[PDB]
Design an enzyme around this catalytic site. Structure first.
Site, mmCIF file in Angstrom:
data_model
loop_
_atom_site.group_PDB
_atom_site.id
_atom_site.type_symbol
_atom_site.label_atom_id
_atom_site.label_comp_id
_atom_site.label_asym_id
_atom_site.label_seq_id
_atom_site.Cartn_x
_atom_site.Cartn_y
_atom_site.Cartn_z
ATOM 1 N N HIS D 29 1.233 5.493 -4.619
ATOM 2 C CA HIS D 29 0.726 4.564 -3.616
ATOM 3 C C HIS D 29 -0.795 4.535 -3.587
ATOM 4 O O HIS D 29 -1.384 3.516 -3.209
ATOM 5 C CB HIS D 29 1.262 4.932 -2.234
ATOM 6 C CG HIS D 29 0.871 3.963 -1.162
ATOM 7 N ND1 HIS D 29 0.883 2.599 -1.356
ATOM 8 C CD2 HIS D 29 0.445 4.158 0.108
ATOM 9 C CE1 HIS D 29 0.492 1.995 -0.249
ATOM 10 N NE2 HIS D 29 0.218 2.918 0.655
ATOM 11 N N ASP D 33 -0.171 -0.896 -4.288
ATOM 12 C CA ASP D 33 0.125 -1.213 -2.897
ATOM 13 C C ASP D 33 1.500 -1.827 -2.737
ATOM 14 O O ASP D 33 2.144 -2.179 -3.720
ATOM 15 C CB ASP D 33 -0.926 -2.163 -2.343
ATOM 16 C CG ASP D 33 -0.724 -3.586 -2.797
ATOM 17 O OD1 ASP D 33 -0.267 -3.783 -3.931
ATOM 18 O OD2 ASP D 33 -1.036 -4.510 -2.026
#
Lengths: 233, 233, 233, 58
Positions: D29, D33
């Site tokens: 992450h 995104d």
């Protein structure tokens, strides 16, 4: 009342006439025919037409499908992608395709060059440029410097079937016709389908009946299931 | 047993053979094709056949409908009603139509002259006179002095489809064929209709694909609804 | 990348090319077309296939039916069984039929000689011998010394319809095509049938439209009911 | 990739049994995104359900 009207032919008009007749008598032209079911492509346009336009900026047409089918056919049957030069048969090993566009004074055939590396969006854009210049009468001799194979489309005029004429030094030409609903036999049932006849005129002293039929069968198969262009089957 | 039999050709037989071959090699002949639904005319004959005969003294046939359709097509596409004379394209501005009739020794083509001013009854009567003289072998060279366009009808022999040959100095010819029942797609239904193929052979060095298709589309339209000859649509 | 490849033609390759072009320009070739329903013969093979093989030692094929139909047609229309030699029309009065077989290097046409006296079992055996020698490249010039009429079969390649080319000094050629299911009109009903198109290319300066159509109608009739070969109807 | 298993599915208001497979995408992450991960996996779903889209580039 019973009086004629005479118009002398321009030197351009006579030269075109002479070249056509010399081509007719210098080649052993024969024509093979076949039919293709067009519904699978009409469904693709109906499903992905808006998404294709939104992503690429140009509408998805039928022409981009014909060019891809022809290119694959020219790979499988090189003898169609060849010409005779005196005593030599010349194999080109590249893919330039002439396509007919309507000018205010008849059809003319500019060349799509290196069509094997273009995508469908690129082909449609390239065809649009040639179409606009042709309608404007603005094509240069460079654009008309011939390729290896020609596609002509008489469907816009509503033709059912016809014999196209080769454009030397090329050895073959593909004629598209009008799409018309006809009843067809499908798995023992009768179904109305949008059908189109295909015509291939070829120079028999270079291409044999095997190659001409195989070339036209390949085009039929790729147009009835474009996914086969991905699988290479 | 395995013995041949030789017959020298008469000077007439050789001259006809030579003229045909010279015509073949002096013109860039191509052929377009189409199909026409004939039921609308068969209904007219079935409805008005007796009244037409009683009023005019001759039966209503198919030929009178073909001539009227051809004349209207020749008006809309003058380039079909023309011929090449050396360096000049000659536009005739009048309507003489050759039509093939069967003699005891093959087909011959007398001319229907100034067919644009005749009525349907007049055309049928004029065709009957030519037919009887042809069967009697009594046509003079004046009757065979050629016109601008030729209609030939192979339906009497039962032909499905064929390539007709031009008759110089004319530039195009229309070939009629046998009427045969075929299933057709009509508004999403399958219906058996009496259908006939049309063949147009044309000299490509004078006529282009647009004109040939448009000429044959016009004939199809006028035969499928003769009322359009009245409306001019 | 954009580079050609040149291959000089062998003296054999050039001679074949030259002969084809000379034949094209020395004859006034025209083509007529028709369609034949093949189910009646498929039923015969399905019913008598095993008994025929057990009694004769060879399988019952389609070719033996085509040869018998052609021979009967050549009897009814002698002008198709003829050729032009200078100023003379030569009537052969015997029945030799050329048939195309596929070699490793294209189609070649050996001759079936005196086919009017052979039975169906004999024809199938004779065709098998020519086929094996052709595949082995072992045919002699004697076997290729031409006959009076040629049968070519493009069905193995999957062709729908095409224009065959005459093989001089012969005057006509018959082209067989692929058998494909199509809906047909039969006594007012729509029925799917296995249909095949027939193509006849003929030299018009010897054969007229009457004979060409009649010749092809005869073949259609005999193939749709072989019993007519027994009745002579 | 996971096992292909028959499941009832909603298709144009009807219930139809289809051979279905779940897709799982694990991603880092701190680089990718939520927009990209979902879009990446939606693209794979679309191309597998109609391979012709690989030809059209849609």
């Amino acid at each position: 009342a019973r009086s004629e009207k005479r118009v002398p032919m321009t030197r351009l008009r006579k030269r075109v006439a002479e070249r056509l007749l010399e081509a007719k008598n210098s080649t052993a032209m024969l024509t093979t025919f076949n039919e293709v079911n067009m519904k699978p492509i009409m469904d693709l346009r109906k499903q992905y037409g808006e998404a294709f336009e939104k992503r690429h900026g140009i509408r998805l047409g039928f022409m981009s499908f014909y060019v891809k089918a022809v290119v694959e056919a020219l790979k499988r049957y090189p003898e169609v992608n060849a010409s005779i030069d005196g005593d030599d048969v010349v194999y080109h090993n590249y893919f330039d395709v002439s396509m007919a566009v309507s000018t205010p004074r008849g059809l003319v055939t500019p060349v799509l060059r290196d069509v094997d590396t273009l995508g469908m969006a690129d082909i449609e854009k390239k065809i649009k440029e040639l179409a606009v210049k042709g309608r404007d009468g603005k094509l240069t001799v460079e654009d008309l410097t011939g390729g290896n194979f020609t596609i002509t489309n008489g469907g816009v005029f509503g033709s059912l079937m016809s014999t196209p004429i080769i454009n030397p030094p090329q050895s073959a030409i593909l004629g598209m016709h009008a799409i018309k609903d006809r009843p067809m036999a499908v798995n023992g049932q009768v179904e109305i389908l949008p059908m189109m006849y295909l015509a291939l005129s070829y120079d028999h002293r270079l291409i044999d009946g095997r190659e001409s039929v195989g070339f036209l069968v390949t085009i039929k198969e790729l147009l009835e299931d474009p996914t086969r262009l991905l699988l290479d089957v």
